[PDB]
């Protein structure tokens, strides 16, 4: 039964070969036509046997080009068969990543029979990331999916900002002025600032006469799952998973994590303490 | 140690002690033991002793007149701790056998 699959490589590379680099529309739609029409369940002609092959061999294909970026000094921040993020050194961005990118391009369609079909470079110049569930950086973009789930009552939301993007700023004073150890002076500053933001909170939020419940104080998205009870706990818990994570240097976060737990009297270890992703993700 | 785990697990608390050479902790324990020697002829602390007859007056008073309850201890601090206490010991060599480790801290708390 492999002719069938071999007569595929042979239409879809008539179709390819097709393109007739003096012109072609045809062909271009048509090979974008295969894009579509090997994603598409309402497609026929043994379809799932077809969309099935075509996953497991992009995979074996995907997988060789994320793993062998390895020989060229970089990192490997987020992959997908359309998104990919790479790091390789720390200044003149463009000259960068210019060789690793097309060098590896080149080997990659060399290798693949072809691959070279990539493009690059929007304004990510300093993030934080972990997709856009909980990402920020400077080009001050923040987005933070957790962000929607705190309530807007005693500005919750905007302390969240302020804190993040005010430790965002400060670490990023410290790398331009360079051009690692300003975490420490930024966690002190966050010892007195986030006491205080909490107290503010804290007050603000329980002397509301309109709760009826704490619990109905939570905004509810299509994603929102957990029982969400006393807003400055949600907000030290989303700060501190960001903080913690934005940095190795968590023992300072871990000290904040302890004092401000012990600030609003509910105990580390406990159920509650440890941070849940208010949003069940579905894709 | 060449111990087996029941005689092992049944001691609350392990301790080792080791003659390792640190020539300024050398210096500092060769001077306190010259100075033993030289106190004590017929003739780490830094916060003194109790006298020894007040020491003993002092133990003999607290495990009678004293009596130590337990009303709350932040139960799953302990729980969780001793779970991967637990999880890290059955990958390496000392033996946390279930609940001997929980209730050897909660004789240390009293």
Known sequence: ?283 | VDLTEPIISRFDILCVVRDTVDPVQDEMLARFVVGSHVRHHPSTYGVEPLPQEVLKKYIIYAKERVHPKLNQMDQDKVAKMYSDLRKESMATGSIPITVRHIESMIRMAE
Not at chain 1, 207 to 216: A, D, F, I, V
Not at chain 1, 243 to 270: A, H, M
């Open chain 1, 1 to 283: 039964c492999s002719n069938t699959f071999r007569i595929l490589k042979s239409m879809v590379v008539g179709w390819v070969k097709e393109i007739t680099q003096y012109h072609n529309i045809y062909a271009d739609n048509q090979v974008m036509h295969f894009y579509r029409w090997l994603r598409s369940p309402s497609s026929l002609l043994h379809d799932p046997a077809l969309h099935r092959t075509l996953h497991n061999m992009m995979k074996k294909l995907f997988l060789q080009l994320i793993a062998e970026f390895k020989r060229l000094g970089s990192s490997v921040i987020y992959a997908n068969f359309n998104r990919i993020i790479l790091c390789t050194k720390k200044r003149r961005v463009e000259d960068a990543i210019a060789y690793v990118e097309y060098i590896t391009s080149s080997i990659h369609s060399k290798e693949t029979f072809h691959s070279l079909t990539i493009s690059f470079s929007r304004c990510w110049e300093f993030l934080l990331w972990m997709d856009p569930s909980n990402y920020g950086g400077i080009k001050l973009e923040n987005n933070w999916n957790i962000l929607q789930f705190l309530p807007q009552a005693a500005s919750c939301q905007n302390y969240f900002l302020m804190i993040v993007s005010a430790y965002i700023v400060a670490v990023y004073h410290c790398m331009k002025d360079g051009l690692t150890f300003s975490q420490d002076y930024v966690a002190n500053e966050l010892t007195q600032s986030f006491f205080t933001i909490t107290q503010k909170i804290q007050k603000k939020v329980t002397g509301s006469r309109n709760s009826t419940e704490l619990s109905e104080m939570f905004p509810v998205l299509p994603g929102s799952h957990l029982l969400l009870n006393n807003p400055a706990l949600e907000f030290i818990k989303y700060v501190c998973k960001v903080l913690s994570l934005d940095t190795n240097i968590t023992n300072q976060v871990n000290k904040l994590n302890r004092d401000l737990l012990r600030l609003v009297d509910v105990g580390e270890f406990s159920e509650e303490a440890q941070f849940r992703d208010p949003c069940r993700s579905y894709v």
